[PDB]
Amino acid sequence: MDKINPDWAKDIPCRNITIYGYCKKEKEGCPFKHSDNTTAT
Ligand SMILES: [Zn+2]
């Protein structure tokens, strides 16, 4: 599996958001949907 559609990263929370509650590297090529604006369940 070499092709990865954004739908994959957007379905997997980054350890940053999960552990640090923030992904300062989000601005970088860090994979996953790091959404820290729309706080939802
Ligand atoms: Zn990240």
Q: Which domain holds residue 24?
A: 1-41
What is the 3-class SS of 5-20, one letter each residue? Answer: CHHHHCCCCCHHHHHH
Elucidation method: NMR
Amino acid at site 39: T
> What is the CA(39)–ligand 1 centre distance, in A?
17
Structurally, the chain folds into a number of domains equal to 1
How many angstroms separate the CA atoms of 21 and 2, rounded?
29
Q: Are 30 and 16 in contact (CB under 8 A)?
A: yes
Can you say how many angstroms the Cα of residue 6 is from the centroid of all Cα atoms in its chain? Answer: 10
> What is the CA(2)–ligand 1 centre distance, in A?
20
Q: What is the DSSP letter of 32?
A: S
Q: Are 16 and 22 in contact (CB under 8 A)?
A: yes
Q: Is the dihedral of CA 20, 26, 30, 31 positive or negative?
A: positive
Q: What is the DSSP letter of 2?
A: -
Q: What is the CATH number of the domain that holds 16?
A: 6.10.250.3160
